[PDB]
Design a protein around this ligand. Structure first.
Ligand SMILES: CC(C)[C@H](NC(=O)c1ccc2ccccc2n1)C(=O)N[C@@H](Cc1ccccc1)[C@H](O)CN1CC[C@@H](SCc2cccnc2)C[C@H]1C(=O)NC(C)(C)C
Lengths: 99, 99
């Protein structure tokens, strides 16, 4: 798969079986999703960007199906305006930025 | 060129001849740089990030030289911890996200 960047590179991912629409984001160091309940086993963390920071819950070894692949990665849940799949996941998938 | 996403995809760009280090950001709709003065023909813009909104100065038709290409694009200026090149520039450069 190749994504021109005219539109936002958004895809459907399933996180612990729940479909979510996510942004493939090379500028994001971490992955953060909203509207999913991941349970009790997390660590309270913070994540920031333009405009400041937000509280998050960090989950490890989360099952993810996306772009026809199956991976386990660290995902944060928090009040993000858009769901993000950052470098942690992109790397696991073998995705690259090319010119 | 190809960028594996193990490290942040950061390159040197010259903005109206001035060198700056920029992050190639598929998740960003706009481009925002700090610490270059681009002059007085700007219009103020409010831009939203993961943690909040910031005030920016938007400049149009800025000459950019990056990855051996020359483009003219819109650039905002404001307090960003990291200089970012978003989809507006990535598109004009002809970059893609591939898997
Ligand atoms: C998701 C985060 C883990 C991620 N941040 C980082 O990876 C990160 C790295 C180093 C840092 C150093 C100091 C302080 C913060 C740092 N944050 C991030 O926000 N990345 C940004 C770019 C970035 C990198 C570094 C620092 C700051 C910002 C993302 O790619 C682009 N981002 C994706 C989330 C949307 S949410 C914004 C919004 C509001 C309402 C509705 N819809 C959208 C906004 C958009 C963005 O920042 N876009 C620009 C740059 C155009 C403002």
């Amino acid at each position: 798969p190749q994504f021109s960047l005219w539109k936002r590179p958004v895809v459907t991912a399933y996180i612990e079986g729940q479909p979510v629409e996510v942004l493939l984001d090379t500028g994001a160091d971490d992955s953060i999703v909203a509207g999913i309940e991941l349970g009790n086993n997390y660590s309270p963390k913070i994540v920031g960007g333009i405009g400041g920071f937000i509280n998050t819950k960090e989950y490890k070894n989360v099952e993810i199906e996306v772009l026809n692949k199956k991976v386990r990665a660290t995902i944060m849940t928090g009040d993000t305006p858009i769901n993000i799949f950052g470098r942690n996941i992109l790397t696991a998938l073998g995705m690259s930025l090319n010119l």
